[PDB]
Amino acid sequence: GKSHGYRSRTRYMFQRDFRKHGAVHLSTYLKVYKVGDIVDIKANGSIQKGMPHKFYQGKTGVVYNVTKSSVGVIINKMVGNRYLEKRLNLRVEHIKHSKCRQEFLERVKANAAKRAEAKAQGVAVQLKRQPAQPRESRIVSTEGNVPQTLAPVPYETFI
Amino acid sequence: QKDAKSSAYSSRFQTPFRRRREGKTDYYQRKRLVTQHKAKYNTPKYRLVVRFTNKDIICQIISSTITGDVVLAAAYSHELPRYGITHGLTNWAAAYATGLLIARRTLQKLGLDETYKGVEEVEGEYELTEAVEDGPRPFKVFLDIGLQRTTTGARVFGALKGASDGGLYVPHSENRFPGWDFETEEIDPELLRSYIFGGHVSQYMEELADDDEERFSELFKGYLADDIDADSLEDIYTSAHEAIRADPAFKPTEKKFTKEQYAAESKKYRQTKLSKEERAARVAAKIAALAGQQ
Amino acid sequence: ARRPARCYRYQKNKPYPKSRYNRAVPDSKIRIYDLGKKKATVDEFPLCVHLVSNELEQLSSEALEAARICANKYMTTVSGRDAFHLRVRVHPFHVLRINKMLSCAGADRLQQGMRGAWGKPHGLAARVDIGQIIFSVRTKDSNKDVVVEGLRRARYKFPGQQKIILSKKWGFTNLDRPEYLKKREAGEVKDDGAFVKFLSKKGSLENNIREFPEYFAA
Amino acid sequence: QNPMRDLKIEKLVLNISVGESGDRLTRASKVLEQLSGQTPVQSKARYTVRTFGIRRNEKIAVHVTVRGPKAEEILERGLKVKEYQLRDRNFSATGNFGFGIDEHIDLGIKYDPSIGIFGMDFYVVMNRPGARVTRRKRCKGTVGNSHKTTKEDTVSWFKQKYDADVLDK
Amino acid sequence: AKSKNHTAHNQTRKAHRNGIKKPKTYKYPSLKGVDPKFRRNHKHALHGTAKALAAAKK
RNA sequence: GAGAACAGAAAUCUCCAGUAGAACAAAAGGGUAAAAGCCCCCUUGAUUUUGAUUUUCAGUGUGAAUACAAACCAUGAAAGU
RNA sequence: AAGCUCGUAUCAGUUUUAUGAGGUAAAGCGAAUGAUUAGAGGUUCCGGGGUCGAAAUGACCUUGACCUAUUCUCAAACUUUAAAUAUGUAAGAAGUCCUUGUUACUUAAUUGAACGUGGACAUUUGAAUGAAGAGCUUUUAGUGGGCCAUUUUUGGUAAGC
RNA sequence: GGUUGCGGCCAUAUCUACCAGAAAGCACCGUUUCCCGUCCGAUCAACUGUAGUUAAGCUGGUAAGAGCCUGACCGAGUAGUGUAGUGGGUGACCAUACGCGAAACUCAGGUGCUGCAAUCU
């Protein structure tokens, strides 16, 4: 018959790594996790206590409560036509700080800095971000770069 | 030829970290010694680090950070001579004094010298450092011994008893001190009290100072030259115990040099890499010499 | 007794090899893959002729056997027993399956139709892609017309389309004739039983002097 | 050079592998007791063979590790049985040599009528000072190849001491 | 008589008519599943600030 | 792989090599090496009180599990478990 | 269907930027596992045979395994590497920065943790495009036999299976 | 810069064969009276730093070394793949249009960096 357990179809998903098996480095435990920190959930096969479900591998969440050795995470889960709020308890081995939020914070610092310097002269610093614009004109010169003409090649078997 | 490994075996070998390869860090235990309760977000889980080596006793208090472990206080046994200890810096009594030298030293810079005086009279009673009323909840540190094995009478635990007598709140049990009884689950303080003062080396001084002289002249010679006898083996350590409490200030040394001349004299005795151009010119010469039919 | 090759010409199923999940299969009906002067050295056979596949299909292990014998017989009786070395490049590794049904009248009572229709092994086959070499024969340049006719005759034993192509490479190596010739004038090549070992600049220098000595005694 | 790379014996092992368990080992250990001076320990059985008649953990053998001057003391008088000749085949690649004897009646325990007659499997392990880096828990390293005992080094040391000699090979 | 066993057909298209949007995000989320030890502390700390501010803003 | 009386391809003993090519009840897959493996010591934390949560899902039940809170202990020098 | 609260926003079957996750396609086997073609070179105190030998840990020829460097070909339940298309999170005012009040939790320590007090930063206020109004509630119908096409894919020789 | 104590990243740090290492330190190294564990003071418990030795450990260097790491218009815009056509072909399959784009191979380079403290001609 059919077989739907907790770790069904997780063969390669919780497979450890290439050449990284064994005890985990202690930067994973030295970390400090606050309420409201944005985290991603990558499991660790060695640590069996406090593993998440397969459904949350690679899913990013936010910390709501913190415990002695583990951490609670808020996850929104698509079921039906909606998002149902899901709460997970995870040891800090299967949780790592989401770096996605981080580059926005460094953007705020420059964004706050540029406005502060701009108001001294009022130049409309244009703090927004722009997408990649179409290129503008240029002059390409042929000193020592004279064009060389290429032609289609005939057929050969090479075997 | 026999100890030849294929490229298939070598490629897939995952090396131990760097100090598992040196047999230096029992990471399985260290994982317990530095991992903090998360709700204590940034509190440093300090650690009484005593590591035993030939000809020296090393005592340091260490916490752990991601970029590396941090030490605030260090006590050694080669700095005990300032208290009048030049012989036997590697016994259970010197391993005691360092636990007392560090305790005053680490409590100095913490400002907790006025309180938590510890056990001023040396008696050997198993007594934890009690928490004083409306006081700063005395300083808490923990042993790590590493790969050394815990037994009864091990000299790693002269450092702990040397620390609690200094006021450091180190949790411990009384069953691993020398003098503990296996038949009846208790310890006799009198026999332990001697070992604080060197009880084991005490009687062996006078018992063979007169019976055997050929041996007693080869070793224990420094005691003979310095005229140290068995009866004075206790009051010299009493001076140190009151010397530790007097000046734990831990003045540094002069190094007889600076950091620059230490490197400058050592840069000329090392060996350096061979240049990429030099390697190829070394390859070409060997071809023309060896394969060139002389 | 055996189904026509029509029924398994196309790659419809995933590869089904022999493993611990089959544990019982009929053995391959081709077991010899080297013919002629397989003992020959590298440099007596400068010519290579290939028979390539222009289709994505499956060749039966037993069609390979029939093709092998026909090409072997012609070249032996015309060119000589030791004038060539014939290698069947592709090996049959795919297991075919049959769902046995009763061929007698009244069969519709005891065969359960399509229920539980997972078939049993009754044959093997090879899987060949576009341009995959099927046969590679190495011989002397004077033997061109013979081995071409040999593969042309063996081409009649295979389903689909096949091409006969001269190889730019020297024998069974992967270097073309001018490159092998300039790597043979120096000490860069060392004879083996049928292949040749090439010198390379990576490795310990003392080893590279023990083998290919004339490369350095210039 | 050669300041502290002298060859000295690590230990001396005596093995007596009986095919059965019973009253023999009780007295087979007695000849080990008096000859060595130290009590021996039994050897269990790792797996059943059902042809030697040995069961799981049936205490089929007994052996004792001897170290120090007594092992040297046992070796010389024990090797006196072998009349001071020895095959080089008895020497191993890693640098260990030994010998076996039948009828221990020759030495020490001369007949001891209660125990009976028994043989021994002598074995001598050599090393040089510094071998504990392979044993010590901290900084457990590997001896260098210069300091490593060789098969020819063991046989040469065997000639000089005891003035012994080696057999054909 | 046999029938169809299971398909997900037309299930995603039904899900986009009244679709699958993220529900909401409120400020001051619930305290369900929080460490009780910190929660008892929170009440006592909360009362102290409220009473202290009440006296200052009496 | 090299060696030792009976003793050989399989007894027991020694050394060297050895990233798991063994074992961890069973099915298989992950995991695990100063251990999660093998041996020794002590004990019942396979205890007590009700809550939250994951899985399957209707965000029902049942089973399994996760991290907690309030007691009583075991072990260990201790960190901790 | 009835509406309800608001009036362009806590929006979106889309793209961009930044950051994750994955083990498929391909690829690979002079890399682990397993399968698999061919010879070459070596060693047996320790494989089977023929020759010279009473035998030797004596020698010679062959066959079997064993080791080394190669060689041909592969895998749904093999894999070092590893796409495409898909998939989670973020792109602000519920933000950022500064000072300090509470606590029965935590720390050696007014050390931290959470919540607040006071102050500063407003229309390029923090990518694109669009928004047809947005968010919410109650109730109730029918349906709960499906089928076809390109692409992916399993069983079957196949099938308007 | 060497060394030691404690670590961070966990091979650019590993493995094989050699060479060298001044000072200090680590080290090997001596003993069983003392507490402690063994068949065995071998590991270790305990003691001395004195009778000694750099032989090993460790560090560095060497090798057209093995492994590993880095980069490349090196293979290669190749394999593969999203999207399109009343394209081609009996079929198997293939070409074309708008996009994304490997791996093996080849070549070149490299073979630990670093935090706190103490300590060193």
PDB file of C-alpha atoms in Angstrom, chain B residues 145-245:
ATOM      1  CA  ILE B 145      39.835  19.343  31.694  1.00  0.00           C
ATOM      2  CA  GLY B 146      39.892  18.284  28.041  1.00  0.00           C
ATOM      3  CA  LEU B 147      41.048  14.747  27.343  1.00  0.00           C
ATOM      4  CA  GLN B 148      42.486  14.087  30.804  1.00  0.00           C
ATOM      5  CA  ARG B 149      40.599  11.390  32.684  1.00  0.00           C
ATOM      6  CA  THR B 150      38.839  12.156  35.967  1.00  0.00           C
ATOM      7  CA  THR B 151      39.804   9.955  38.928  1.00  0.00           C
ATOM      8  CA  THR B 152      40.045  10.257  42.696  1.00  0.00           C
ATOM      9  CA  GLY B 153      43.147  12.225  43.606  1.00  0.00           C
ATOM     10  CA  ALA B 154      43.694  13.643  40.124  1.00  0.00           C
ATOM     11  CA  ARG B 155      45.679  16.858  40.304  1.00  0.00           C
ATOM     12  CA  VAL B 156      43.275  18.659  37.992  1.00  0.00           C
ATOM     13  CA  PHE B 157      41.081  19.058  41.069  1.00  0.00           C
ATOM     14  CA  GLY B 158      43.689  20.882  43.101  1.00  0.00           C
ATOM     15  CA  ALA B 159      42.931  23.785  40.775  1.00  0.00           C
ATOM     16  CA  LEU B 160      39.203  23.693  41.553  1.00  0.00           C
ATOM     17  CA  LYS B 161      39.707  23.491  45.320  1.00  0.00           C
ATOM     18  CA  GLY B 162      42.290  26.228  44.878  1.00  0.00           C
ATOM     19  CA  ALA B 163      39.601  28.307  43.184  1.00  0.00           C
ATOM     20  CA  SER B 164      36.712  27.863  45.620  1.00  0.00           C
ATOM     21  CA  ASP B 165      39.071  28.839  48.435  1.00  0.00           C
ATOM     22  CA  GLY B 166      39.496  32.043  46.409  1.00  0.00           C
ATOM     23  CA  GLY B 167      35.769  32.758  46.224  1.00  0.00           C
ATOM     24  CA  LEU B 168      35.066  31.646  42.656  1.00  0.00           C
ATOM     25  CA  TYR B 169      31.704  29.865  42.511  1.00  0.00           C
ATOM     26  CA  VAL B 170      32.710  26.665  40.728  1.00  0.00           C
ATOM     27  CA  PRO B 171      30.175  23.823  41.103  1.00  0.00           C
ATOM     28  CA  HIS B 172      31.780  20.598  42.277  1.00  0.00           C
ATOM     29  CA  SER B 173      31.358  17.380  44.224  1.00  0.00           C
ATOM     30  CA  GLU B 174      33.591  16.123  47.022  1.00  0.00           C
ATOM     31  CA  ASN B 175      34.026  12.568  45.707  1.00  0.00           C
ATOM     32  CA  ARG B 176      37.061  13.216  43.469  1.00  0.00           C
ATOM     33  CA  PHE B 177      39.400  14.725  45.995  1.00  0.00           C
ATOM     34  CA  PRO B 178      42.385  12.785  47.370  1.00  0.00           C
ATOM     35  CA  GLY B 179      41.195  11.510  50.724  1.00  0.00           C
ATOM     36  CA  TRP B 180      37.686  10.516  49.647  1.00  0.00           C
ATOM     37  CA  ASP B 181      36.582   7.073  50.829  1.00  0.00           C
ATOM     38  CA  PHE B 182      34.990   4.599  48.426  1.00  0.00           C
ATOM     39  CA  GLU B 183      33.670   2.242  51.117  1.00  0.00           C
ATOM     40  CA  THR B 184      31.903   4.999  53.078  1.00  0.00           C
ATOM     41  CA  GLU B 185      30.635   7.818  50.872  1.00  0.00           C
ATOM     42  CA  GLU B 186      32.445  10.728  52.545  1.00  0.00           C
ATOM     43  CA  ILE B 187      35.850  12.387  52.845  1.00  0.00           C
ATOM     44  CA  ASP B 188      38.178  13.102  55.748  1.00  0.00           C
ATOM     45  CA  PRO B 189      39.169  16.794  55.713  1.00  0.00           C
ATOM     46  CA  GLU B 190      42.380  16.262  57.708  1.00  0.00           C
ATOM     47  CA  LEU B 191      44.054  14.049  55.107  1.00  0.00           C
ATOM     48  CA  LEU B 192      42.971  16.409  52.321  1.00  0.00           C
ATOM     49  CA  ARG B 193      44.203  19.404  54.323  1.00  0.00           C
ATOM     50  CA  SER B 194      47.711  17.937  54.208  1.00  0.00           C
ATOM     51  CA  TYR B 195      47.611  17.621  50.414  1.00  0.00           C
ATOM     52  CA  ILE B 196      46.757  21.321  50.047  1.00  0.00           C
ATOM     53  CA  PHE B 197      50.071  21.858  51.841  1.00  0.00           C
ATOM     54  CA  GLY B 198      51.760  18.956  50.062  1.00  0.00           C
ATOM     55  CA  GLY B 199      50.871  16.049  52.329  1.00  0.00           C
ATOM     56  CA  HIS B 200      51.952  13.411  49.823  1.00  0.00           C
ATOM     57  CA  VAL B 201      55.375  15.015  49.302  1.00  0.00           C
ATOM     58  CA  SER B 202      55.576  15.738  53.041  1.00  0.00           C
ATOM     59  CA  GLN B 203      56.420  12.339  54.536  1.00  0.00           C
ATOM     60  CA  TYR B 204      58.465  11.214  51.531  1.00  0.00           C
ATOM     61  CA  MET B 205      60.826  14.071  52.358  1.00  0.00           C
ATOM     62  CA  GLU B 206      61.954  12.913  55.797  1.00  0.00           C
ATOM     63  CA  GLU B 207      61.425   9.170  55.352  1.00  0.00           C
ATOM     64  CA  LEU B 208      64.194   8.919  52.734  1.00  0.00           C
ATOM     65  CA  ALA B 209      66.266  11.947  53.718  1.00  0.00           C
ATOM     66  CA  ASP B 210      68.128   9.514  56.005  1.00  0.00           C
ATOM     67  CA  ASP B 211      67.486   6.012  54.630  1.00  0.00           C
ATOM     68  CA  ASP B 212      68.569   6.505  51.000  1.00  0.00           C
ATOM     69  CA  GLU B 213      71.090   9.207  50.108  1.00  0.00           C
ATOM     70  CA  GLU B 214      72.254   8.139  46.640  1.00  0.00           C
ATOM     71  CA  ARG B 215      68.741   8.710  45.288  1.00  0.00           C
ATOM     72  CA  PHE B 216      67.959  11.680  47.540  1.00  0.00           C
ATOM     73  CA  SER B 217      71.052  13.442  46.168  1.00  0.00           C
ATOM     74  CA  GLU B 218      70.257  12.965  42.465  1.00  0.00           C
ATOM     75  CA  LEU B 219      66.695  14.280  42.615  1.00  0.00           C
ATOM     76  CA  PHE B 220      65.361  16.579  45.337  1.00  0.00           C
ATOM     77  CA  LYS B 221      68.786  18.228  45.032  1.00  0.00           C
ATOM     78  CA  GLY B 222      67.343  21.730  44.722  1.00  0.00           C
ATOM     79  CA  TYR B 223      65.727  21.260  48.119  1.00  0.00           C
ATOM     80  CA  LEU B 224      69.100  20.166  49.516  1.00  0.00           C
ATOM     81  CA  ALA B 225      70.981  23.113  48.006  1.00  0.00           C
ATOM     82  CA  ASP B 226      68.286  25.572  49.128  1.00  0.00           C
ATOM     83  CA  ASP B 227      68.180  23.840  52.553  1.00  0.00           C
ATOM     84  CA  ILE B 228      64.470  23.002  52.538  1.00  0.00           C
ATOM     85  CA  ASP B 229      63.493  20.297  55.025  1.00  0.00           C
ATOM     86  CA  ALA B 230      60.266  18.412  55.672  1.00  0.00           C
ATOM     87  CA  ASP B 231      59.131  20.509  58.644  1.00  0.00           C
ATOM     88  CA  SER B 232      59.436  23.766  56.670  1.00  0.00           C
ATOM     89  CA  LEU B 233      57.446  22.377  53.731  1.00  0.00           C
ATOM     90  CA  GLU B 234      54.189  23.688  55.222  1.00  0.00           C
ATOM     91  CA  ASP B 235      55.019  27.190  56.457  1.00  0.00           C
ATOM     92  CA  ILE B 236      56.525  28.144  53.089  1.00  0.00           C
ATOM     93  CA  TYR B 237      53.162  27.455  51.445  1.00  0.00           C
ATOM     94  CA  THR B 238      51.373  29.393  54.189  1.00  0.00           C
ATOM     95  CA  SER B 239      53.448  32.398  53.139  1.00  0.00           C
ATOM     96  CA  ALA B 240      52.257  31.969  49.546  1.00  0.00           C
ATOM     97  CA  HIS B 241      48.609  31.736  50.599  1.00  0.00           C
ATOM     98  CA  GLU B 242      48.974  35.070  52.387  1.00  0.00           C
ATOM     99  CA  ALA B 243      51.198  36.266  49.526  1.00  0.00           C
ATOM    100  CA  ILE B 244      48.481  35.548  46.951  1.00  0.00           C
ATOM    101  CA  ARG B 245      45.951  37.570  48.934  1.00  0.00           C
TER     102      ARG B 245
END
